[PDB]
Amino acid sequence: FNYDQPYRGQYHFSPQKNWMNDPNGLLYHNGTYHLFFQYNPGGIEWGNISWGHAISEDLTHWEEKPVALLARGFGSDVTEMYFSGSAVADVNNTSGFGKDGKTPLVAMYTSYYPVAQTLPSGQTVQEDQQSQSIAYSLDDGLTWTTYDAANPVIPNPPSPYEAEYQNFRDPFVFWHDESQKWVVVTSIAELHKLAIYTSDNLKDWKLVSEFGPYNAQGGVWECPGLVKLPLDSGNSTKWVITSGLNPGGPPGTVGSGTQYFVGEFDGTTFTPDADTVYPGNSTANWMDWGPDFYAAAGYNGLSLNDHVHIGWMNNWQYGANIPTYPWRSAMAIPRHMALKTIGSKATLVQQPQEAWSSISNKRPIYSRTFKTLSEGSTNTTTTGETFKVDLSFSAKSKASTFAIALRASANFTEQTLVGYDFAKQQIFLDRTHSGDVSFDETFASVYHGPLTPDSTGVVKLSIFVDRSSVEVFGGQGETTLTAQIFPSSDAVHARLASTGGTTEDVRADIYKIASTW
Ligand SMILES: *[C@@H]1O[C@H](CO)[C@@H](O[C@H]2O[C@H](CO)[C@@H](O)[C@H](O)[C@H]2NC(C)=O)[C@H](O)[C@H]1NC(C)=O
Ligand SMILES: *[C@@H]1O[C@H](CO)[C@@H](O)[C@H](O)[C@H]1NC(C)=O
Ligand SMILES: *[C@@H]1O[C@H](CO)[C@@H](O)[C@H](O)[C@H]1NC(C)=O
Ligand SMILES: *[C@@H]1O[C@H](CO)[C@@H](O)[C@H](O)[C@H]1NC(C)=O
Ligand SMILES: OC[C@H]1O[C@](O)(CO)[C@@H](O)[C@@H]1O
8 A cells, every 4th residue: 555645644553544543452462563443444534433453563664454343234234333442462361262273362342332232142232332342363363253142241330320321431451460360441431530340351340449530630531541660770660540531631732632640559459649649630640741642552462661652643622624635543653651750750751662773864864063053043954754853952041942943834934843942941842833724723733841951951852753743752751742733745844943042052963764654
């Protein structure tokens, strides 16, 4: 398939055609990274919801596979859609679904029932009911058999929340080594609360705890996850819950986004650290401070120092109307997950996880240093649409802002600014003039995230630009900002801007990135 379209991310996953949302079923198994996803095999907006499937060996060069779980009744009257979920390798065959070949892979997902019906299990469901169901694969994920004899395996929200039957979703299941149990985290989405269950077999589930609400609650809670991450460089760890909400995303945005909490988990209960939860209902720990980082989910099958989350690189505010064809939506750059102590606080740090050396020029197309960069804007360089920028500079500069203007037309009336506000100690990303912003009024915005200089006073930014996106990794990765842009074909220029004064100790390098398709 030829993926050479305007706006087609060349180093982000998207399906060849049709609509995609949340990442699903993330599992590394026998050398392979599986990427499932919410998919419409019949259209370019949300509908007919199914699990698509793609694989890579390197989180970079993806190959699209056949549809894994195709909406039941697709092409006729649809009776069941496969909402979001997760996947594990049941290597010891606790489910019993293994035969005389491979052990089973097992998927746990939300069944959405668009019509009232009685299921093969003999259970009755109501119109718009959401329940938790399982399927299995004996061919390493290529094809899947749904567990029709008993699905759904978690039909109802826990009491006293039975009324929440339409909004009960997004199971993240994983093997908890310490308790030798399967654990699943689900979202009672309207209540801003998660429900945690255990199992010895993936079929029979017992409710063990509920978590939340805390922090951000200005939207329905979705896409919960729980993972053990390393802290700093020794042997300390902490558990982290990641969860989405829609709307009520990060300050400065309108729509969806992703928050987290740091704590401990004992196999049944997640206890948030005292400093991860904030009085009230507004302040939160944002995984990403930009508008287009949602439904972020973790990989099963990875070790402590190898953990990866993938996010949907879109926003429900306007996601249906991005000017893409014949696909809609991409995933963000996969995000390596760790914790670092920053300003005396265990803080999520992310790294851009692709095989960059396989696709990046070694020689920068642009590279400069300035002991003092003068106020104003430098000479223009041409970057193409796909590249990485490395910037560093002194926090003590007199400029009000320092930034790169990129994906810019030659006269820079079209541009996306990525920089730092010295007084506010914030990263900004201004896409107000970034190109096509016509399809939603909230799209043409300036976004912000906090970033304290390092110990030596240096602010560092790494910026990844692909055909319709910008991703900013600040400092060691403690602040990311992810933003779609839709620039015109000529918007391939860049320059540096020191506004209101000079910027000291500037270092700037830009490297070209090749296609992974
Ligand atoms: C769900 O999938 C169906 C196809 O099974 C889509 O179907 C109809 O609408 C399309 C318009 O783009 C046509 O291309 C299809 O031929 C037509 N066919 C059928 C079976 O109805 C439908 O639009 C999809 N739903 C959404 C919301 O995209
Ligand atoms: C598989 O069994 C072994 C031995 O009991 C154990 O180490 C492991 O935790 C089991 N479960 C999984 C999912 O690996
Ligand atoms: C800008 O760079 C171009 C290309 O190298 C060069 O021709 C031009 O002289 C530069 N302008 C200035 C003022 O240096
Ligand atoms: C900027 O360049 C574009 C052509 O790409 C043009 O449409 C526009 O008029 C120019 N703007 C100004 C202010 O010169
Ligand atoms: O596609 C439906 C799925 O999408 C999400 O709403 C979030 O983007 C999930 O909560 C749900 O499972």
